[PDB]
Every structure is written in C-alpha cells, then in structure tokens.
Design a protein around this ligand. Structure first.
Ligand SMILES: [Mg+2]
Ligand SMILES: [Mg+2]
Ligand SMILES: [Mg+2]
Lengths: 199, 211, 220
C-alpha cells in the first residue's frame, strides 16, 4: 500500500525550555516496508510568531504521487473524513478530493506509521532549519526521536523500539563552524532538545 | 505464585491492512520469574468467519483458561479484561461494552470458582501472564500461517518472531516489560518466504507477511 | 537550568506482590544534560509503618527538596504532583478549582512551606509531576536507595521498584537505569558497601506490567 501522510513538528524553545512556535510541516510518501520515506515535501512555518496546513500539503503530494490513501493526524480509528473530532472541518474537503481523485482521506492519527514518519521528518527538517539559521538555537524535537548529523545529511530515528525501527534521512549541506548537542528536555519527559551554537 | 492467563491474538489482514478475523487463542501457565511459559494450550478459530466484536474471543479465552487451570491447579486465573483486577464472578453493570460481555462470563466464573476455589480476575493489560499469553498467541498465529499459506498476519502489540528450522520464538519489543518471550516447537515448510514489518495502520504493531 | 526535584519510590511487597509501604524519599540536583544526579539527599520511611494517603510522602518530598535547594541554590524545584507546573506558593483552594478535594487538605501544609522558601530565595516550587525529567531521576534514585535499604535490612525481602527501571549490583555501588529508551538514558549511582550472606534476583512483577521486582534472599 502507498500512503501519503502529514504532520507538524519541531519547536523553537526559549531560555526556559518553553515552546515559542512550531518549525516544520511535512508530507511524506510511505510504502512497504513502512519504516521510512524517500519522497516528501516540507513547509516551514514561522516559529517566532494547522491540521489544515497538513491536509493541504498532503493533498499537494498526493496529486504528485497518486497514493492509495491519505493519513491525517486525527485519532478516529481510521474513519474516512468524508464519512465522519474537530476534523469535521475537513469532511467537505475530503468529499471533493475523493470525487476528484478517488483518494480517501482517513482520520487515523496516532495509530498511523506514516504520520509518525512525517513527524520524524519534521524533526529532521527542524534541525536543518536550525543548521541554516544558527547565534544559538534550542529546538524541541518531536516525541522520543534523536538525530545524527553527518557531513552531507541528517538522520532521524525514533527512540521507541516498539515502533519497529522508524527512521528518516535528509541530504543537506552541513556548515562548518557549528557546535550541536542533543539531550532530554527537562520539562517534557521523552522529548529531546537539539541545541546548536555557531562558533 | 502460579498463574494461568489467556488471550486471543493474531489477525488475518486484507489488502487494506484491516483485520477480517482472529487466529489463535492461548492459555498459559506462568511461574517465577514470570518471563515465559513452559506449559500452555492453544485453540485456533476460523479467521474467515470470525465474530470481530470480541464476544467469541473472550468466551474462548475463559473456557481455555479454565481448562488449563483444571490440569495445573493454579493460584488464580488472569483474564484479558482491564477492569481493575475484580473477580469476574462479581462483574455487574453496577461494578462497571464489558457490561454485555459480563453477561456470559460472570455465571461461568462463578461456576468455576465453586468447583475449584480459583478466582478469575479481570486484570487485563496490567497482567504479565496475560501479556505472555498474547505473545504465544502471536507465535501460534505465525505457526498457523506457516500451515495455511499468501497471507498477511497482524501480530499482537509490539512483538516480533524469529523462525528457526525447528521452533518459533516470540519476544516483546518493549524492554520496559523486562524481557518477555515464548518458544514453540514446530516444523517449517519449503517453498515459502516471510517478512516482518510495521503495520502502517496500527502503530507499534508488526505485520507477518508470508508467501 | 539547574533543577532540584524529589519523589518517593520503592516498595516492600507482600508475596501477593502488593505494596506494604514505600521506602525511600529522594531529593536530587539535576543539571544539563539532565540524565543523572551527582548531588542528592535521601530519607528512609518505615515501609511497615506507612501512610498511603501519600500525605507523608509529599510532605517528605517538599521538605527534602527545600533542604537540598538551600545547599545547591537551583533555579527551580520540581514537585511530583501533576498540575501543569503551577507554583505551590499560589496553591489555594480557589486555585485548585477527588483530585481537587485531596490537594486542598495538602495545600494547608505545602503552600506555606513553598511561600516561605520563595520569600527567602525567590525559588519557585512547581507542581509539574510526571512530565519532569528531574522528578523521574529522583524516582530512579528512590528505587536505588530502596535496594540499599533492603540490603542493609534483611530472612527475605521483595522490593517493588518504581516503573520500568532495573538495578545492577556492583561491589562498591548500586546502579539504577530506566528501561525506557524513549527517556534518553536516565540513570543514577549510589556508593554503598554490599553486605555478605545474601542473594538477589531481578524479575517482572506479574501483577504490575512494566514494574520490576528486586528480591533478596538470605544465604545458607
Ligand atoms: Mg500533529
Ligand atoms: Mg485480549
Ligand atoms: Mg511521586
């Protein structure tokens, strides 16, 4: 099965580890064996000042790759959004999109692996954003994921082995003259902080 | 202590990764140090003609638990019903989906308690032996798929299997549970192949695909 | 950010695996990268003489946190009560609005303590509870100290550890570690002299999934 999903993640934190705003909305194409995505879109929000932005970006990707279904971040047991819970706002959108493409948009939320994969990529693109904006940043990553930074790419991985080894990967130019570290958010258990400093 | 628990796990999936029915119901005997079971029973259902509501599974679960309990005489029976550890023979609408299911479990547990003095408790996901039964269910579902294959089998929550020449090993993927596992002797056919990968519809659940 | 937190954990269990009482209350100083504590205080209860209202525990927790905070001067104290991070100074019955009904009896003891300590220092005590990593680290240390207590106080003893943690025994120390990799590798170490004539085993609590049992048995 080919699935398009979307989620928003990554948060700019203040000096007291309190979130200012979210960083990245990502749409991903996920196919078997459903551990990662090689095909995705990113929309950077403005962190320093929603489910709609996810569903829109998902639709944009779906028209490009023609998936079997779209997963949205709403936990409703996988019910088709056109056959519908604030996400009733998206029912008419789900209705007309199905009529146009034959693609079902389903409210599966936290039960969805592709949504989780989209979330991991949001974390990765949040780090990329940090790499490309850093004199010091605190980025709050999505729940239990870590990143590795190599010369030409960032790797994202879920910390939960129960998820079966979900991961992400984004090629990007990693600048010299930076210092990064990764550590637990003291205020939010199971969430990691990506702190970066320009040398 | 000596505990008997039961559960039903393993689901034949369709093309849309949605379950058509359940496969294996297992009763286990668990003793110290409570990581696995050396003594267990299994009952297979018909997955292609299954009561997906849950009534059938829980009936099979309590019947099979009782049966194993008669043989091994455990201190107590754990049922996969997350209701605070209350005795099933006292399950009323008052003490409380499960209201309906209590209707066909309460008299049965009451009868069994009168025969044996052994309580059947609705402890559910708080029970390690229940979880061990669930893991064995996944193992027996995989054994079943090895004998009825192609197939798409949805495994119980966060567990994987390894397939040897002479046995199937199941293990929890959650290290927080403390290394829960199970083994089942079996033979493995020729002219087949299998993969284990995330169920894209059910986070933290794995899929066993075989051809 | 430098944080002092406290929690009470570790339980003497009966052979039906039910807690008789809690053992250790621990206050910890936690600094970046917030994985462990190298500065901590411990107070032992009597598990056989224990109040599971939780009143005695939260009282012990706050006073021990304050005592430690006076010596290390943290930016903030984390208390294990999950209320969203409200300052305990401002914890009145008006602000509370059975969870509500319970914390208004406790507020009569907690609020003035927090108030007095803030006036002295400007340091806030926040009711953050379970989302706090330093609280979790305190909990891990409580599990460690409960084992140390059990080692010193045993012909057999079942120690119920706090949720998903293990302990390792070394010749000169006890190590505690979270079993949840999602927490990023939280742990703690306490130096002790391990007594002879005893054996130990770590295994799952069959009645409480994700809780381990540390059982000690006298030798010979
Ligand atoms: Mg979301
Ligand atoms: Mg069950
Ligand atoms: Mg506590």
């Amino acid at each position: 099965m080919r699935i398009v999903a979307a989620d928003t993640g990554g948060a700019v934190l203040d000096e007291s580890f309190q979130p200012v705003g979210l960083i990245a909305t990502v749409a991903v194409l996920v196919e078997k064996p459903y551990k990662t995505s090689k095909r995705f879109l990113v929309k950077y929000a403005d962190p320093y000042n929603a489910i709609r932005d996810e569903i829109e970006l998902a639709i944009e990707l779906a028209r490009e790759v023609s998936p079997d279904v779209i997963h949205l971040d709403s936990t409703l047991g996988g019910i088709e959004v056109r056959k519908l819970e604030l996400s009733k706002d998206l029912q008419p959108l789900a209705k007309k999109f199905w009529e146009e493409t034959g693609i079902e948009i389903i409210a599966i939320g936290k039960s969805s692996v592709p949504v989780r994969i989209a979330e991991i990529y949001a974390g990765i693109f949040s780090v990329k954003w940090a790499l490309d904006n850093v004199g010091g940043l605190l980025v709050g990553l999505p729940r239990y994921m870590e990143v590795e930074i190599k010369k030409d790419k960032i790797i994202g991985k879920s910390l939960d082995p129960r998820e079966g080894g979900l991961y992400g990967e984004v090629k990007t130019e990693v600048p010299q003259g930076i210092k990064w570290e990764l550590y637990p958010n003291p205020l939010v258990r199971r969430f990691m902080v990506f702190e970066i400093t320009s040398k």
